[PDB]
Structure formats: C-alpha cells, structure tokens
Amino acid sequence: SLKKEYLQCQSLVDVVRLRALHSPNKKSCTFLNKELEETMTYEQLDQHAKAIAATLQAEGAKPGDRVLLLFAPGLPLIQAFLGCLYAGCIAVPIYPPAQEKLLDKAQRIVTNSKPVIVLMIADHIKKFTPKFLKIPAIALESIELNRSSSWQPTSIKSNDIAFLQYTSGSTMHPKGVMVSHHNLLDNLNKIFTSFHMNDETIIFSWLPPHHDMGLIGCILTPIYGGIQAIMMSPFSFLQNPLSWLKHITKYKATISGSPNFAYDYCVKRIREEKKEGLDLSSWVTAFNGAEPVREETMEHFYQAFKEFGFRKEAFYPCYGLAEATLLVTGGTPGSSYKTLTLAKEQFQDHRVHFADDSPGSYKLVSSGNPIQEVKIIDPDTLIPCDFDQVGEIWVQSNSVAKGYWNQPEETRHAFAGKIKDDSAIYLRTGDLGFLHENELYVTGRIKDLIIIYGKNHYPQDIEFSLMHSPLHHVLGKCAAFVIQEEHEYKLTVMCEVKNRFMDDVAQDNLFNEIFELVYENHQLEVHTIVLIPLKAMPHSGKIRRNFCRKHLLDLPIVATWQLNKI
Numbered sequence: 001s002l003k004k005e006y007l008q009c010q011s012l013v014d015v016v017r018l019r020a021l022h023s024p025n026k027k028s029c030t031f032l033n034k035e036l037e038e039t040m041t042y043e044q045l046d047q048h049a050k051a052i053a054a055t056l057q058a059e060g061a062k063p064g065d066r067v068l069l070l071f072a073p074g075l076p077l078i079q080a081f082l083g084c085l086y087a088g089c090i091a092v093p094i095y096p097p098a099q100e101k102l103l104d105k106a107q108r109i110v111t112n113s114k115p116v117i118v119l120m121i122a123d124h125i126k127k128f129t130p131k132f133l134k135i136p137a138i139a140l141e142s143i144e145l146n147r148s149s150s151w152q153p154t155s156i157k158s159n160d161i162a163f164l165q166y167t168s169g170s171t172m173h174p175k176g177v178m179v180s181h182h183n184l185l186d187n188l189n190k191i192f193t194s195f196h197m198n199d200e201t202i203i204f205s206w207l208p209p210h211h212d213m214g215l216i217g218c219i220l221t222p223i224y225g226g227i228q229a230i231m232m233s234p235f236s237f238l239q240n241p242l243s244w245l246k247h248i249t250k251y252k253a254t255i256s257g258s259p260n261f262a263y264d265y266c267v268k269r270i271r272e273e274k275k276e277g278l279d280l281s282s283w284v285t286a287f288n289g290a291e292p293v294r295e296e297t298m299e300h301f302y303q304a305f306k307e308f309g310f311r312k313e314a315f316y317p318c319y320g321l322a323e324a325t326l327l328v329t330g331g332t333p334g335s336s337y338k339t340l341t342l343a344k345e346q347f348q349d350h351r352v353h354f355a356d357d358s359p360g361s362y363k364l365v366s367s368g369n370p371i372q373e374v375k376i377i378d379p380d381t382l383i384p385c386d387f388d389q390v391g392e393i394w395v396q397s398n399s400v401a402k403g404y405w406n407q408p409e410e411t412r413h414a415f416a417g418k419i420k421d422d423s424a425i426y427l428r429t430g431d432l433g434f435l436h437e438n439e440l441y442v443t444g445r446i447k448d449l450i451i452i453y454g455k456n457h458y459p460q461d462i463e464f465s466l467m468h469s470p471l472h473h474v475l476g477k478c479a480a481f482v483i484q485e486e487h488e489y490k491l492t493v494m495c496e497v498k499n500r501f502m503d504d505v506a507q508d509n510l511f512n513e514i515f516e517l518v519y520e521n522h523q524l525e526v527h528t529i530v531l532i533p534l535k536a537m538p539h540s541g542k543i544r545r546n547f548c549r550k551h552l553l554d555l556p557i558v559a560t561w562q563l564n565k566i
C-alpha cells in the first residue's frame with residue numbers, strides 16, 4: 001500500500017519528486033526493443049522531466065498551454081509526458097501517424113487542442129517535417145539534462161487539467177477528455193487498491209501508451225505506486241504475440257492485460273511447439289477490458305496455456321472509459337469472474353430474461369463490482385432502472401473527468417446527467433448494461449455500433465489502407481464492414497486474391513499481414529477475414545460493399561479466417 005507521504009501529495013508531479021528524493025536509484029520503467037533492455041530510475045525520470053519542463057518554459061509555454069506529444073512507445077515519451085506536467089502544461093499524447101501523409105486525425109486534434117509546441121523523437125522530426133501541422137516542433141534528443149537546473153516550479157492545483165485523452169473512436173470529431181490532477185490521482189489510487197498491488201508488483205504491458213489502459217494503468221499507476229513497469233511496443237506484440245508471454249515469463253510479471261481480442265490472438269497465432277519454456281505462474285492478474293469480454297476467449301486461452309502455468313483465476317474482467325479517467329468496475333483479484341446465461345428473447349421493457357445453461361441462450365461475463373459509483377438509468381426518462389433491468393450506465397466519482405476540451409455543448413450531453421427527479425451530477429457513458437448482485441453486466445451501446453463505425457468512416461478507411469499497402473500486389477478489390485452476429489459485432493474484411501491456389505502457408509501469412517496492417521493503421525482488430533477469387537466483386541465502393549455483405553450472408557470463397565475460432 002502507498003505510504004502516507006505519497007497519499008498526501010496533491011499531484012503526480014509531487015509524487016514523482018518525492019520518489020526521486022527518497023528512492024532515487026529505484027528502477028521505475030523498462031522498455032524492451034527486441035533483445036535490448038533500457039531502464040529508467042526515479043532520479044532519471046525526475047531529471048529528464050525538469051529538463052523538459054525547463055525547455056518548454058524557455059520556449060514560452062505557460063501553465064494551461066497544451067503540448068502535443070507524438071507518442072512513440074518508449075521511455076522518451078514517458079519523460080515528455082511528465083515534463084509537460086512539471087511545466088504545468090496540458091499534455092496531449094497522440095499515436096504517431098502510421099503513414100507520413102495520412103494526417104487527418106492528428107490535424108483534427110491539433111485544431112481542437114491548439115497546442116503551442118509539439119514534442120517528438122528525432123526519427124519523427126525526419127518523417128514528419130521545424131513544424132508539424134504548423135506547430136513548432138522540438139526533438140526530445142535535443143533537450144540536454146543540463147537545462148534541468150533552470151526549471152521554475154509552478155503552483156499546481158488539484159482541479160488543474162493535467163492532460164487530454166482523446167477517446168478511442170470519435171475520429172471525425174475527436175473528443176479530448178480533460179483529466180485533472182485530482183481525477184488522475186483518484187483513479188490511480190483506485191487502480192492500485194482494486195488490483196491488490198503491493199511493493200512487489202511487476203506490471204508488464206505492450207498496450208498503446210498514449211491513452212486509457214496502456215497509459216493510465218500501465219505507466220502512470222506504476223510510477224505513482226513505486227512499482228516496476230516493463231513494456232514493449234504494440235507493433236512488437238502484433239508481429240509476435242508470443243513475446244508477450246515470453247516476457248511475462250522472463251520478468252516474472254505479476255499483472256498484465258489487454259482488450260479481449262488479444263487473448264484470442266495469442267491462441268490463434270502461437271503454435272504448441274513454440275510454447276516450450278513459457279512459465280506464466282507469476283501472472284496473478286490478467287485483466288480483460290476496453291471491449292466486450294467473452295467467456296469463450298478466456299476458456300480458449302486458459303486451455304492453450306494452462307500447461308504453462310497460466311491459471312484461470314488470474315482472469316480479471318473490468319470496465320471503464322476515458323471520461324471516467326479509466327477504471328469504473330472490477331472484481332476481486334484471484335476470484336473467479338462470474339457469468340450469467342440469458343434467454344434468446346429479451347423483454348421489451350429491457351428487463352433481463354434469464355435462461356438455464358435453454359438452447360438459444362448466451363452468456364454474459366461480469367465486468368465486476370462498482371469501484372466508482374454506478375447507477376443504471378433510463379436514457380430517455382432519466383429514471384433509475386430496477387436491478388436486472390438494462391439501462392444506461394451512469395457514473396459518479398472524483399475520477400469523472402472535467403469535460404471535452406473546447407467543446408461546451410458536447411460536454412453538456414455527456415457530463416451533466418441528472419436523475420429525475422433528484423442532487424448529484426453524473427457522467428452518461430453511452431453504454432448499456434444491468435446490475436445484478438452488485439456486478440455490472442455490460443450489454444451494448446445506445447448508439448447502433450454499425451452506425452458508429454459508419455460515422456467514423458472505418459470501413460472506407462480500412463479498404464483504403466489495404467489498397468495503399470504493399471498487400472495490394474497480391475490482391476484485387478477489398479471491402480470492410482461490420483456484421484452483427486448472435487449478440488456480437490464483428491469487423492469483417494474481404495479481399496479478392498490474385499492467386500486462388502496459394503497454399504495454407506501463404507493463406508496464413510496473408511491473414512496475419514492483413515490483421516497487422518489494420519491494427520497498425522487503425523489500432524482496430526479484424527475479427528473475420530474472407531478471401532475470394534479475382535473478379536468475384538462487381539465492376540460504388542458502396543454497392544461494392546453491400547454486395548459483399550449480402551452474398552456472404554447467403555458465394556465463391558477461397559478461404560476464411562476467424563480470430564476467435566480454433
């Protein structure tokens with residue numbers, strides 16, 4: 001548990017200063033690049049932060065100013081994040097754009113947040129420019145540690161905004177969640193406590209470090225709690241899922257996790273023979289959150305790795321979202337997570353229709369107990385639902401964020417939930433679910449998810465990615481779309497292939513390359529890939545798309561790949 005002197009700090013900045021004073025040589029973060037290891041102690045993080053803050057100050061940045069960070073995974077960008085905080089500037093972490101000229105998302109973020117400076121690694125100054133989208137750019141490599149002594153401390157307030165975190169999927173009109181210093185520490189504390197962390201905790205992570213779980217859970221929480229973080233890049237996991245498990249083994253990581261898909265992805269790609277040497281016994285919490293959590297995924301993963309020390313006990317479903325900083329519900333670590341079986345037909349008043357383990361039934365996994373206050377509320381009447389009745393998940397706590405940057409009206413729709421009639425104020429999540437036995441079961445979204453993929457232009461942009469990647473040389477036309485399938489949504493990609501007789505080796509190689517490309521460009525996961533003969537698609541990307549959708553439902557297929565199927 002955190003010592004009192006750390007609990008008493010009013011910002012993450014003061015926490016880091018204090019750990020740098022009291023345990024300067026304690027190792028904090030380790031970043032892995034292939035076989036290479038780079039490490040950073042509290043003393044080093046603190047010194048780099050000061051040097052970085054000093055530079056921002058010398059360049060004319062004032063408290064409250066936004067500073068953009070091209071978040072290449074690594075220690076430098078972590079240093080940059082703290083450096084912003086040390087200067088009282090609002091950090092704005094973004095995924096560095098996958099392709100040099102595909103900058104639209106970054107541009108929208110730049111226009112929204114209006115940063116005065118952007119920080120990035122030397123390799124990116126090259127790729128991207130000095131100015132980046134009209135914003136003056138500074139290479140992190142150029143900030144000399146000598147500058148540290150010139151840092152002038154600011155007077156940070158609890159309610160001051162520490163950083164913006166842009167939601168995962170509002171790409172056409174990005175929402176920058178405003179996370180205050182008080183928000184951040186409240187959620188870090190709930191994470192450290194709820195996950196039963198201690199002095200010996202070791203967190204391993206490959207997750208995108210610029211937002212939600214990969215930032216708040218896997219970097220800021222360890223730094224806050226005085227425990228080790230060990231990390232590699234998402235690209236590394238995507239290219240070789242096995243590395244996740246090899247690193248947990250070598251480092252004896254105790255806590256690591258991911259969205260649900262990643263457990264399936266290990267099952268799908270890791271062959272029996274390659275598992276030799278794995279020892280997952282140290283892994284006591286394997287958290288599963290950020291998307292719908294599936295029993296089948298976890299059962300599959302458990303049987304694929306139980307012979308290598310993985311315990312089903314370790315699986316930890318959890319629920320949260322950026323507007324609530326991060327963690328909202330979660331269970332007790334080491335406990336078996338619960339499931340419920342629902343009948344095929346549900347009730348129109350959204351009450352829950354349970355079934356015996358009937359023949360059209362389906363299972364929902366619990367995302368745990370409310371860590372933040374959770375109320376299930378009717379999104380139309382604003383009247384509380386009964387238990388075992390689906391309504392909107394409303395959240396209330398000190399972790400609830402301050403709004404969406406520079407968006408008063410959009411903020412009004414999400415952050416000003418009032419129950420009829422009476423008094424508290426709630427975040428409205430957009431999410432549907434029900435409480436049962438004080439466990440939250442998330443059931444879906446208010447917004448039709450097909451209609452939301454369509455709004456962010458995902459299928460269209462994914463088709464473009466495929467056509468503009470080197471994968472094009474072996475394909476014909478392609479189509480991406482979301483199909484709703486027995487209580488699940490699946491992102492489906494289908495491609496004409498030049499060689500209808502490529503072997504099983506080529507098939508698998510191609511499936512893997514397509515999954516990796518779509519994650520690289522969109523950090524989205526394809527659930528189903530369909531291969532078909534050249535010319536099989538009609539000579540509109542729209543009528544082209546709807547043909548693929550309609551005839552998959554009722555054609556010539558060369559091969560099908562399904563992420564969650566063994």
Ligand SMILES: CCCCCCCCCCCC(=O)OP(=O)(O)OC[C@H]1O[C@@H](n2cnc3c(N)ncnc32)[C@H](O)[C@@H]1O
Binds near residue numbers: 216255293322445
């Ligand atoms: C130390 C480890 C700590 C890490 C702690 C982990 C706990 C929090 C992880 C989630 C953070 C989040 O995904 O952020 P975002 O705003 O980008 O999207 C949020 C949205 O995604 C969905 N969603 C999240 N969970 C879900 C779940 N269980 N079931 C089904 N849907 C889930 C919702 O639709 C939701 O509104």
